[PDB]
Design a protein around this ligand. Structure first.
Ligand code: 67Q
Ligand code: GLU
Lengths: 275, 262
C-alpha cells in the first residue's frame, strides 16, 4: 500500500534502458517481461536498468511522496491506444490496474483523461513537424499537409502511428490522415533516417522528442518548422488510476520541484542541446 | 444556481471598457467592478469562459477582483494567514471560479484546484528599447542598486517566486520598493522610463512589445509556467472543465484564441 507497481516505456531521453546483478549509478531497476516463444504465454522477467529525465522525476517523487516501487516496462503496445474499445500500452496497464501509475513521455489528451487521472503536466509538448532541408511550410495546418494532392507532385510526410499524435491528426484532418498512412514510420530512428536520405520530406511527431532530437543532431540539419512551433500544446504527465489517492501529493510534489529549481536542473541535465 | 465568476483586468486576456450610456457595450459580457459599477469585459479568457459556458451548459455572472490582485498568502496581523486577490475571493465564496491568466504553483495548488493548463508560457523581462541586458542574470538584476530599477506586480505569482528562494532575496528586497499594483501601471511606467525593467508573464509582455513598439522583451524565457482555471477543492465542474480545455487545445480552439488575441 506504500509499495507501488509502476509501468514505463523507453523513449530517450525521458526513459533510457540499459543492460544490467545490480543497476549501477543513477539508474534504477526495471524488469521487462520477455516471452519464451511466440506460441506461448510463457515468459520471464529480464532485469534491466532505467535512467533518464522521467526516471529522475520518479526518484524525486519517491523521495518526497514517500513510496517504494517496482518499475517494469510495458510489453502490450507502447504509450497507449484504444483498440476495439480496449486500452493497450501504459494507459491500459493503469486502466486494468496492473500498474498504480505510469511514468515516461506520456502525452495528456482528452480521451486518455476519460479513463485515467493525470498529474499536472511536467514537460511541455505538443505536435511539431521536423524537416531536414529548408522549407516554407507553416506548420501542421499548411495546405501542403491538409490537401497534399493539390500539389504535383505531393509532399511525402508521416508519423509513428498509434500514439497521441496520430490520434490527433485522425480527429482533425481526415484526408491528411489517410494520405499519411502510407508513410507511417516504425519509430523515431526510422523516420530520421528517412528524412536524411530524402525518402521522407517531413516527420510529424511529439514536439518534446523532436526538439530533443534536433538538439543532439550532428551537423544540425534537422530542425522543427516555424521556430519550433507546437500545435495542440499539452504535456507529459504521470497517469494514475481514476480517483487515485496519490494524485494530490504527486501534483504538489511536482509543483514544488518547479519552485526548487529541481526541474530546471533536470531539464539541463537531460535536454541540453548542441544546436 | 448560477456560477459567480471572478476575473481581473489583463490585456489581451481580459479587456475592461466602460459601458456606453444605455448600460450596454467580438463577444462581450457585462461584468461589475470597482463600490461596484457595470462594465464591459472581453478578450481571450472571456472567449474561453463563453466556450466553457456553452459546452458545459451553465450560466454565470462575471465580476472583477475587488482588490485588483491575482493573489498571494500573507500573514494576518500575528498567526493566521490569508489569501488576497482572486485567490481570496474563491476561497471565501465570493467567487465560484477564477477565469484569468492565473499562474499554477505549489502554493496556490495547496488550497485550490487548477484545471489542466489552457496556456503554456513563462516569465521574461520587459524593458524600453534603448536598454540592453543579458537577461535575468545580468549584474544589474542580480546585484541591484537604485541606479537601475526593476519591479513586478504586487501579490502576484512572480512575487511569490522571488520571495521563495533565500538566494533570490536581495532581488526581492529591491523589488519590494518598486512593485506596482497592476501590470498596466508597470508597463506604463516602463514607457515613461519611470521603470527600467518589468519582470512578468511572457504571454502578456510579448503582446505589449508586439504593439507598443517602443518596448521590447529580453529575451528569452528564464522560467516556464502556465495558466489554468481556478476552482475550489470540491468541485463538481473540475473534471469536465479540464476535459474541455484539453479538447480545445487538441481541436484548434486554443490555437485560434491565440491568433485572435495574441
Ligand atoms: C521541455 C520541458 N518542458 C518543461 C520542463 C520542466 N518542467 C517545467 O518547467 C514545469 C513548469 N511548470 C510546471 C507546472 N505548471 S504547468 O502549468 O502545468 C506547466 C507549465 C509549463 C510547462 F512547461 C509545464 F510542463 C507545465 C511543471 C510541472 N513543470 S522540460
Ligand atoms: N508522446 C506520445 C507518443 C508519440 C506521439 O504519438 O506523439 C504519446 O504518449 O502518445
Amino acid at each position: 500500500d506504500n509499495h507501488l507497481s509502476i509501468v514505463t516505456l523507453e523513449e530517450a531521453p525521458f526513459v533510457i534502458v540499459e543492460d544490467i546483478e545490480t543497476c549501477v549509478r543513477n539508474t534504477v531497476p526495471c524488469r521487462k517481461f520477455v516471452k519464451i516463444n511466440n506460441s506461448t504465454n510463457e515468459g520471464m522477467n529480464v532485469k534491466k536498468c532505467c535512467k533518464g529525465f522521467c526516471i529522475d522525476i520518479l526518484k524525486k517523487l519517491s523521495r518526497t511522496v514517500k513510496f517504494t516501487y517496482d518499475l517494469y516496462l510495458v510489453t502490450n503496445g507502447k504509450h497507449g491506444k484504444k483498440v476495439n474499445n480496449v486500452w493497450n500500452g501504459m494507459i491500459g496497464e493503469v486502466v486494468y490496474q496492473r500498474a498504480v501509475m505510469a511514468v515516461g513521455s506520456l502525452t495528456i489528451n482528452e480521451e486518455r483523461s476519460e479513463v485515467v487521472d493525470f498529474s499536472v503536466p511536467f514537460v511541455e509538448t505538443g505536435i511539431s513537424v521536423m524537416v531536414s532541408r529548408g522549407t516554407q511550410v507553416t506548420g501542421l495546418s499548411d495546405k501542403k499537409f491538409q490537401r497534399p494532392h493539390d500539389y504535383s507532385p505531393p509532399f511525402r510526410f508521416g508519423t509513428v502511428p498509434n500514439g497521441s499524435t496520430e490520434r490527433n491528426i485522425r480527429n482533425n484532418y481526415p484526408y491528411m490522415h489517410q494520405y499519411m498512412t502510407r508513410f507511417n514510420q516504425r519509430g523515431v530512428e526510422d523516420a530520421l533516417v528517412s528524412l536524411k536520405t530524402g525518402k521522407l520530406d517531413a516527420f510529424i511527431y511529439d514536439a518534446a522528442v523532436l526538439n530533443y532530437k534536433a538538439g543532439r543532431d550532428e551537423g544540425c540539419k534537422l530542425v522543427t518548422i516555424g521556430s519550433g512551433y507546437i500545435f495542440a500544446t499539452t504535456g507529459y504527465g504521470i497517469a494514475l488510476q481514476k480517483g487515485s489517492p496519490w494524485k494530490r501529493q504527486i501534483d504538489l510534489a511536482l509543483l514544488q520541484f518547479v519552485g526548487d529549481g529541481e526541474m530546471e536542473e533536470l531539464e539541463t541535465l537531460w535536454l541540453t542541446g548542441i544546436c | 444556481t448560477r456560477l459567480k465568476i471572478v476575473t481581473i483586468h489583463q490585456e489581451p486576456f481580459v479587456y475592461v471598457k466602460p459601458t456606453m450610456s444605455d448600460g450596454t457595450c467580438v463577444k462581450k459580457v457585462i461584468c461589475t467592478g470597482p463600490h461596484t459599477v457595470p462594465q464591459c469585459c472581453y478578450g481571450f479568457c472571456i472567449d474561453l469562459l463563453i466556450k466553457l459556458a456553452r459546452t458545459m451548459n451553465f450560466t454565470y455572472e462575471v465580476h472583477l477582483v475587488a482588490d485588483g490582485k491575482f493573489g498571494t498568502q500573507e500573514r494576518v496581523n500575528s498567526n493566521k494567514k490569508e489569501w488576497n486577490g482572486m485567490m481570496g475571493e474563491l476561497l471565501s465564496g465570493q467567487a465560484d471560479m477564477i477565469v484569468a491568466p492565473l499562474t499554477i504553483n505549489n502554493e496556490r495548488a495547496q488550497y485550490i484546484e487548477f484545471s489542466k493548463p489552457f496556456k503554456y508560457q513563462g516569465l521574461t523581462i520587459l524593458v524600453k528599447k534603448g536598454t540592453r541586458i543579458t537577461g535575468i542574470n545580468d549584474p544589474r538584476l542580480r546585484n541591484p542598486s537604485d541606479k537601475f530599477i526593476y519591479a513586478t506586480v504586487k501579490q502576484s505569482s512572480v512575487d511569490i517566486y522571488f520571495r521563495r528562494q533565500v538566494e533570490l532575496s536581495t532581488m526581492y528586497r529591491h523589488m519590494e520598493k518598486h512593485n506596482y499594483e497592476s501590470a498596466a501601471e508597470a508597463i506604463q511606467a516602463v514607457r515613461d522610463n519611470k521603470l527600467h525593467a518589468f519582470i512578468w508573464d511572457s504571454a502578456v509582455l510579448e503582446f505589449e512589445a508586439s504593439q507598443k513598439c517602443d518596448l521590447v522583451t529580453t529575451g528569452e524565457l528564464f522560467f516556464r509556467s502556465g495558466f489554468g482555471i481556478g476552482m475550489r477543492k470540491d468541485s463538481p465542474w473540475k473534471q469536465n472543465v479540464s476535459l474541455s480545455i484539453l479538447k480545445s487545445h487538441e481541436n484548434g480552439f486554443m490555437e485560434d484564441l491565440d491568433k485572435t488575441w495574441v
